[PDB]
Symmetry: D3
Subunit: 230 residues, 6 copies
C-alpha cells in the first residue's frame, strides 16, 4: 500500500558526483531509476539543487552576497533539470520542465495546475530555479512543490539510506513521527523545510537513491529508508 | 535605534475590526509610519489580507487551500494600495512591489529597486505575499526582511507582546522560544528568521507612538535575538 | 435553429455577493452557482462578469480623497476575489470553470485570451472574466459589453436588484425598448458608456431581476421577463 | 488667456498617409512641427493616433476583432513614425503601447508617462487600449483621464462645430447641449466617458499651422465643449 | 522524393502587388496554394516579410534609424500574418500565428516546441515579427525558424522561376550566385536545403513539396 | 583617434582558467582591465560566452544544448558583475532571456542610458536564440547600441595572415579590410557574425585582453592586435 504521486528531491552535488558540473554517468543512473518509477505507474515530480556548479564556494567566502549566489544556484538548478530531462527522454520517458522564474524560451512557467495535468499523463515534471527566492533551500522548495502538486510524500535522496538515531561516532530508523524528529533532536532536513512539512503533515522519506532499485520499492510502500510521519 | 525595519501587520489591523478596510486606521498607521520616516528611518512594510474574509467561512466551507491563499494575497494588495495613498497624502513617497506581477497596479518585485527606494527615503510596501501558497504573511515578512537587509522584523500585534502563556516577557533568545514553548510567529516563519539570526520585535500598535517607540530603540514589546 | 440564447454574457453585480455587507456571503454565491449550473448543463454557453461593489468602487474612493486610478485597481482586485469565490462554488456544482483576468496575475488565474475563452465555452466550461477590462475610468458593465462583443455573445444579461427598466424613475416596467428609446425616454442608469458601446455594435441587453429564483434560466430561454434592449 | 498645462491630442491615422496608403513624410513632419509648437509654448502634450492609413477586409470575411488588432498595430507604426520626426525637430519623445511590445516601445504606465511629460518630453500612446471594439476617440478620452489632462484636443479637418449661411461657429458649448441635440464631437462611447468625468473636448482644425499653439494658450479656437 | 515539412518564406513585397498595402486577391491566392499543400498532407510554416507597408525606402532616406525601421517592419509582418491567417481559415485550414515580440492577445508567443505541435496536428504556423531583433533580414528569420522547427527545406518564394536547377552550398559561394549573405551562412553551417522557386506560376508550391524538379535547390 | 563606446566579447573558456566553472583570479583580472577603461571615460558593453560550464557528442539536442550555454553566460555575467562592482564600477546585467529578479530585460535604449552614466552593461543569455554563436550575439548587440567597434578578446594577439595549417610560419596581421578577410579564408569570427559586421561596416579588433594594459591601448587607438575596417 504505497504512494500515488511523490516529489523527489536530489541535491545538486549528486549530478557532478564530485566534481564540478555534470557527470553524465550519475545522471544516467538517476534517469533510469526515475523511469522505473514511471513504469511502476507512479507520478513523480523532481526538484534538483544547484551546488555542482561552483567549486566551492568560494564565491561567498570571497565577496558574493547570499542573494546573488542563490540566483547563481537557481540558474544551476535549471541546467541540472535540462540535462536530466534529456537523459529521461532517451529513456523513453516524456518529461517537462517548469521554472520558478519564467525563462520563456528555455522551459515552461511554474503553473502547478498544468504540472498536475502533466503528471496525470505519465509525464515527469521537473521543477527548476527553486522558488525563485533567495534564502530558501532546495529542501524548502521540495516541501512547497510537494504541497502545491498534492504529493503523498517528499522523497529525500541522501547518501545515508535513512536517519540514524543519534550520530554514529547505531541503527537507522524505519519510521518516526514529526514531533519525535524535532523533539530531541534529529536532523532530516533544513528546519524551515521541516516546519512547512510538519505544519501540513507532509511525510518525508529519507533514502539512498543510487542503491539500484530503491525508489521503485519505496514508492510501492515497501519499508526502505526512514519514513517521517504523524 | 534601528536603521531599517520590516514592519509586518495582520490584515485585520486595517479592519479596526470589524471586517474590511477602516480608513481612520490606515490614516493613523500612515501618520505614524510618516513620523518614523521623517525621523530618518527606512521602512519596508508587509500587510496580511485577513480583513477581507468573514472570519473563515469559505475556508471551512470547502475552498481549495491554494485558492484561499490567493484570495488573501489579493487582500494584501488592496491593503497595500490603500496604505500607499494615505502615506502619499502624509507627504511620503511610497512604492508598492507585488510578488505577483500586476502590470499597472504596482511595480514588480525587485529587491535591489526596493533598497534603492528605501535609501532615497521612500517607503516600500511588499504585496501579494510571495505569490506562493502554503506560506504565511509572517514568512513573507521574514524573507523580504532578509532580502532587503533589514535590521529587524517588527510585528505589530493587538497584544502587548509574547507571554508564557495565556506574564509578558521582555527579551528572549530564538533558541529559548523553541525549547519551551512560545508562539512569536508562524513555525515556518520563525525558522527562517532563526536559521538566519534575524531579530523579531513583537509589540502593540494599538497604543500610539508604539512604532516610534519600537524603532528608536526604546524597550520594548518582546525582542528576540540570538 | 435552437430556441432562446446560445451563448450569453451574464453580468452579476458585486454588491449582490455581498449580502448585506463587506465581502462574501457564501449562501448567495452558492445560490447563484446552482442556477448557472442548471443552465450550463443543458448546453447554454455562459461567460460571467462580476462587479466589485462589495469591496470597492470607484469612483467612490475618488470622492473620499483617494487617487482614482489606484482606487479603480482596488475595485478590480475586489472583482477577482468574487471571481475566485464563484469558481469554487461552480466547481462544487460539478461545473468546470476558468477565470481569465484582464490584469495578468500569473499564479492566480489565466490571462485574458478571448479565443481560448471561447474554446473553454465550446467544451462546456464556464469562464469568469475578472479584473474588469484592466482599464481605470471604466465599469464592469462596460466590461460586460466589451466581452460580450469579443466572444460573440448573443446578448448581455444585466442581472440587477430590480425587475427591469421602468419608464421613469419610480410604473411601468418596459418589456421591450430600443437602445435609442433609452436616451430618448432618458432611462438612466444602465451606465451610459456601457450602453453606448452596446448601441454602437447592436448588442442586445436584457435587464432582469436575479433575486427571483429561476430568473436567469428564463432570461436564457428567450422568455419575456424584464426589458430587452435592441435595435 | 486661460490655456492648458497638459493636453491630449487625438489624430486619425488616415491623416498620416493622407490620402494614400501608408505614411506621408510631409504630413508627419507637419504634425511634428505643430506638436513642437506646443512643447515650445511650455505645454505638456500626449498623443493618440489611429491606424487607418495601412475594413474592406471585413467586407470579404475578416473578423472585426482581428481587423481591430491590425489597426492597433498600425497605430504603433504611426507612433514610431511621429516619434522619429519629433526627434528630428529636437523634441524628446517616448512611445508607450497598451499591449506590451518589448523592445519596440515602453509598456503603458500612466505614472511614468506623466513623469516624462513633466521632464518636458512628448508621450505617444499606441495600440489603442489593447482591446477591440474601442474607438481611437475613446482611447484618447481614457488616456487623457489617466494622465490628468486638462483637455482632449480633437484634431479635425473643419474649424470646429457650426450652427449651419454663412452662420456662426460655436465657440463654447456645454456637454449637455451637444447631446441635447444633436452633434457629434466624438463617438457616443468616447463622448460618454468625457461627460461622466467633466473632461473638456476642443474640436479644431490642425491643418492651419499656429492653431494648436493658439488653442493651448487659451485663444478662442474651434469649439470647446465644457464642463 | 517528398518533403515532410517545409518552411515557406514570403517577401512582404508581394502581399501588396506591390503597390503599398494589402492586396486580398494575392493573399487569397497564396492561402489557396498553401491549403493544397496542407490537404496533401505536408506540414508547413510560414515566415513573411513586412516591406509592403513602406513607400519605397522614403523613411530610411529621410534619416530613420535602422533600429526603428526594422521595428516598423516587424509590426508589418504581423499585419500580413493576420491577413494570411484569416484567408487560410476561410479555406478550412487551421492556422496559428506566433510572434517573436510577444503581443498579448494579438497572437501567440514564439514557442517553437508548440509550433511543431501545431504542425503535428495539421495546423499551419505563421511566424511574425521577424526574430524580434533589428539587423536581421526575413531570409535569416526564415533560416533560423526552419532550423528550430526541424524543417526539411527552406522554400524561398520568388518572382523569378529559380536562379540553373541544382547546386551545393559551396558552389553558390564560389560562382557568386545570389538569399541574404548572413541567412545563407546559417543554412550552410547546418546543411539546410534551400529551394528558390517562383511562387507566381500557379500550383508551383504543390510541386516543390512533392520533390519535383523545380527552380533551384541548394542541397549540399 | 580612439573609440567612444565599445562592445567587448569574452569567451566562456576564458572564465574557467582552464578548468570547469569560475576561476576568481581570471575574472578579477578581466574586471580590472575593464575598470581601467571605464575610469578612462570610455563606454563599454560586454558579451560573454558560455563554454566554461562534447555532450552534443552525447545525444543532447542542439536547441537544448544552446540553452545550457545561455544559462552559463548568465552565470558568468553575474560573476563578472560581482567583480566589477568590487572594483568600484557600477554595472548592470541584461539578459536576452527575461529572468525577473536575476537581471534586467534586454532593452538596448536603456543599455545606452547605463553607458552614458558610466555604468558597464553585460549582455547575457546570448540572443535567446539557438543556432547563433556568441560572436553573432556580440555583432548584433554592438550594432544595437551603436558601438564603434566589436572588441574580440583572443589569447592569440591577432589574426594570422594565412591559416597555420597551410603556412606553419604565418605571421600576424595588423590591419585588414573586411573583403580581404572574406576572399582568402582569414579567421576573425564565425561566418554568420562576420557577415553582420561587414554588411554594416562594423569594425572588429582582435586582441589579447589578458596582458595588462592591452584593452586601454586598444580603446585609445594605439596599434594593437588586428584591426578589420572597410
Ligand atoms: N505599475 C507600475 N508602475 C511603475 C513601474 N515602474 C515605475 N512605475 C511608476 O513610475 C512612476 C515614476 O517613477 P520612475 O519612472 O520609476 O522613476 P523613479 O525611479 O521613481 O525616479 P523619478 O524619476 O524621480 O520618478 C512611479 O509612480 C512608479 O510607481 C512598474 O513597473 N509598474
Ligand atoms: N532584476 C531586475 N533588477 C532591476 C530591474 N530594474 C532595476 N533593477 C535593479 O534595481 C536597482 C535600482 O535601480 P532603479 O531604482 O530601477 O534605477 P536605475 O535605473 O537602476 O538607477 P537610476 O537610473 O540612476 O535611477 C539596480 O541596482 C538594478 O540592478 C529589473 O527590471 N530587473
Ligand atoms: N493560474 C494559472 N493557471 C493556468 C494558466 N494556464 C493554464 N492554467 C491551468 O492549468 C490547468 C490545466 O489546463 P491547461 O493546461 O490550461 O489546458 P486546458 O485546455 O485547460 O486542459 P485540456 O482540456 O487538457 O487541454 C487548468 O486548470 C488551467 O486553468 C495560467 O496562466 N495561470
Ligand atoms: N523598448 C523599451 N524601451 C524602454 C523601456 N523602458 C525604458 N526604455 C527606453 O530606455 C531609454 C532610457 O530611458 P530610461 O532608462 O527608462 O530612463 P529615463 O526615462 O530616460 O529617465 P532619465 O534618463 O533619468 O530621465 C529610453 O529611450 C526609453 O524609451 C522598455 O520597457 N521597453
Ligand atoms: N494571442 C494569443 N492567443 C492564444 C494564446 N494561447 C492560445 N491562444 C488562442 O486560443 C485558441 C487555442 O485554444 P487551445 O485550447 O489553447 O488550443 P489546443 O492546443 O489545440 O487545445 P484545445 O483547443 O483546447 O483543443 C486559439 O485561437 C489560439 O490562437 C496566447 O498565448 N496568445
Ligand atoms: N519553452 C517553452 N515551451 C513550452 C511552453 N509551453 C508549452 N511548451 C512546449 O510545447 C510543447 C507542446 O506543448 P503544448 O502545445 O502546450 O501541448 P501539451 O501542453 O504538452 O499537451 P497536449 O498537446 O494536449 O498533449 C511541449 O514540448 C512543451 O514543453 C512554454 O511556455 N515555454
Ligand atoms: O474595467 C474596469 C472594471 C471595473 N473597474 C473598477 O472596479 C470597480 C467595481 O466594479 P463595478 O462598479 O462595476 O461593481 P458593481 O457595480 O457591478 O457591483 C469599479 O467601481 C471600478 O472602480 C475599473 O476601474 N475598470
Amino acid at each position: 500500500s504505497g504512494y500515488s504521486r511523490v516529489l523527489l528531491k536530489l541535491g545538486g552535488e549528486m549530478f557532478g558526483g564530485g566534481q564540478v558540473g555534470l557527470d553524465p554517468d550519475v545522471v544516467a543512473q538517476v534517469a533510469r531509476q526515475i523511469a522505473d518509477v514511471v513504469r511502476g505507474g507512479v507520478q513523480i515530480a523532481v526538484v534538483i539543487g544547484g551546488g555542482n556548479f561552483f567549486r566551492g564556494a568560494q564565491l561567498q567566502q570571497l565577496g558574493m552576497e547570499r542573494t546573488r549566489s542563490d540566483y547563481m544556484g537557481m540558474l544551476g538548478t535549471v541546467m541540472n533539470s535540462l540535462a536530466l530531462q534529456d537523459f529521461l527522454e532517451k529513456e523513453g520517458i516524456v518529461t517537462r520542465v517548469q521554472t520558478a522564474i519564467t525563462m520563456g524560451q528555455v522551459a515552461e512557467p511554474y503553473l502547478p495546475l498544468r504540472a498536475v495535468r502533466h503528471l496525470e499523463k505519465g509525464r515527469v515534471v521537473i521543477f527548476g530555479a527553486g522558488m525563485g527566492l533567495p534564502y530558501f533551500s532546495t529542501d524548502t522548495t521540495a516541501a512547497q512543490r510537494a504541497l502545491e502538486i498534492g504529493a503523498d510524500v517528499v522523497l529525500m535522496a541522501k547518501a545515508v539510506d535513512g536517519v540514524f538515531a543519534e550520530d554514529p561516532r547505531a541503527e537507522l530508523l524505519t519510521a518516526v513521527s514529526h514531533r519525535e524528529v524535532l523533539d530531541r533532536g534529529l536532523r532530516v532536513a533544513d528546519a524551515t523545510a521541516f516546519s512547512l512539512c510538519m505544519d501540513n503533515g507532509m511525510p518525508i522519506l529519507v533514502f539512498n537513491l543510487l542503491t539500484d532499485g530503491n525508489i521503485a520499492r519505496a514508492v510501492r510502500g515497501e519499508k526502505i529508508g526512514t519514513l517521517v510521519t504523524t
